[PDB]
Amino acid sequence: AWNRVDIAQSELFRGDIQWRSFHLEASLMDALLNDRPEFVRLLISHGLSL
Amino acid sequence: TVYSLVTRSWGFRAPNLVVSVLGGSGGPVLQTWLQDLLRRGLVRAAQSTGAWIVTGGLHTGIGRHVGVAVRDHQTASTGSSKVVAMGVAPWGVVRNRDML
Numbered sequence: 001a002w003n004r005v006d007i008a009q010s011e012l013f014r015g016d017i018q019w020r021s022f023h024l025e026a027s028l029m030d031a032l033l034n035d036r037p038e039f040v041r042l043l044i045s046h047g048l049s050l
Numbered sequence: 051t052v053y054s055l056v057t058r059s060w061g062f063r064a065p066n067l068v069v070s071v072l073g074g075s076g077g078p079v080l081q082t083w084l085q086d087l088l089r090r091g092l093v094r095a096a097q098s099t100g101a102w103i104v105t106g107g108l109h110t111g112i113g114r115h116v117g118v119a120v121r122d123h124q125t126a127s128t129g130s131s132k133v134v135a136m137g138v139a140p141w142g143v144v145r146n147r148d149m150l
Binding site: 014015016018045047 | 078079082085118121125
């Protein structure tokens with residue numbers, strides 16, 4: 001929502017948190033309704049199935 | 051005949067190095083210091099030299115963290131060549147062997 005990749009990439013995907021699937025899918029819906037191409041590329045890159 | 055399968059019938063190039071990874075005590079989540087060791091020590095070494103990684107080919111144990119490391123390295127590197135990861139697993143523990 002803040003449109004700041006440099007926080008989310010560097011603090012939430014270091015590997016400390018084992019993220020489940022629907023935790024990513026809800027955020028991807030927030031990233032598709034708003035206009036953030038960088039977060040869409042970042043969330044598909046973590047092994048999600050459409 | 052198994053190696054002749056790999057280098058002729060499937061068709062893979064010869065290894066310049068073979069590293070076979072063992073372990074699996076800490077079950078679900080490995081420490082990120084060792085995750086940095088796998089991702090930026092071993093996978094980019096197998097990317098550079100041209101090599102094989104022999105691990106369990108399951109989603110359990112070490113092969114989970116290995117496959118996370120290979121996929122994460124293919125994100126942040128453009129070398130136009132994959133990392134040859136080869137996995138062995140026993141036939142009995144397979145989930146969905148019925149479709150084979």
